[PDB]
Symmetry: C3
Subunit: 153 residues, 3 copies
């Protein structure tokens, strides 16, 4: 068959004054991302990438009247991928954040993502890493997400 891979990347600053929302989940924390859902953006990009449809910013413009939260954008991304003729086979991802502890929220993120993509739960994975106190990530000045997606025509 006609398999394709895509990859995705995103990053946002972490400062006091905003909520922390990752993978559709609000996480109690003294800082927040400037909805800024890094995980969902990275996955969205990975999906557009696999389908060879450009990137998230080309589809969902900052100014566009029609566009909403990152979960809504993920659902629209999936519909556009479906229409291009592709079925999603799996998603894997990594969140790099020095803090807070993300492990408790992983299943919720996975359920949110699988729901939005209409995928069996066992085809969505989310992982978490600190940056070992290195760089802006290790200083808690930002949070990064990475994603990989496999699709088939």
């Amino acid at each position: 068959m006609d398999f394709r891979i895509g990859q995705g990347y995103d990053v946002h600053q972490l400062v006091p004054g905003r909520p922390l929302i990752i993978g559709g989940v609000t996480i109690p924390y003294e800082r927040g991302l400037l909805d800024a859902d890094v995980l969902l953006h990275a996955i969205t990009d990975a999906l557009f990438g696999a389908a060879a449809l450009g990137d998230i910013g080309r589809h969902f413009s900052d100014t566009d009247p029609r566009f909403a939260d990152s979960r809504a954008l993920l659902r629209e991304c999936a519909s556009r991928v479906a229409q291009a003729g592709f079925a999603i086979r799996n998603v894997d991802s990594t969140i790099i954040a020095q803090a807070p502890k993300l492990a408790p929220h992983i299943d919720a993120m996975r359920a949110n993502i699988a729901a939005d993509l209409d995928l069996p739960l066992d085809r969505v994975n989310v992982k978490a890493k600190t940056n070992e106190k290195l760089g802006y990530l290790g200083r808690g000045e930002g949070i990064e997400a990475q994603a990989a997606a496999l699709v088939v025509r």
Copy 2:
């Protein structure tokens, strides 16, 4: 069928008195990428991902950047692989890459003898974080699928 994946990463410093060439496109800008070659960060990343998918080592083991990308494709074919698709991301705070991306994709598809629909190029800023966010460098990431 015998599918393989590869991943590629590259970064280059932005310095004065150099042309900015990304995905074969010369972009007007006060700085350009520093490297031994023409320092095309996107093409190097894709090259590494293709060598990676074919398990042929890396770009430094083997070697303008389009010529090298063409040579990469040759050696991937030499090894018995056909390229199925390529995806990538450019991380640049500045300049605006939007008007240049379609050409980048066209360039890459030409060099890899692939139709446009099997090649993708994406772009992000680094939200003003780190060396990328200060406009000190530009990073590229790539994923490639091949089959034997």
Copy 3:
């Protein structure tokens, strides 16, 4: 034809008084990687990619970052257990690719040995495993030699 992909990321600080172990190879160096285990950044990145492809969470879920039993743990034994759990989930590994980002030391003389280790631990031929290396072009904490990063991608099939 039930293919899945996974991706992995790891980084560790490079400090004095530690062995430098990357891809299971002990590299002569005045510094080594800091972690709870042997801190093998490449193997941890690959382990993460495999667990990820099989949708089994991540390396910390399986091999606790704070469990004393993993103090100085051999990250190859961890990779072998990962592959065993991936097989138990019903997946065969098809290939692995990876990158190490390091200012120093020179990794080229050790790369083939790293590849052989990973191939052995994953029960794969050499031609299905790849290890790439590069500098960070003097940029950032990696350019200052404060740590070493690895990236990995894996393809499996159920």
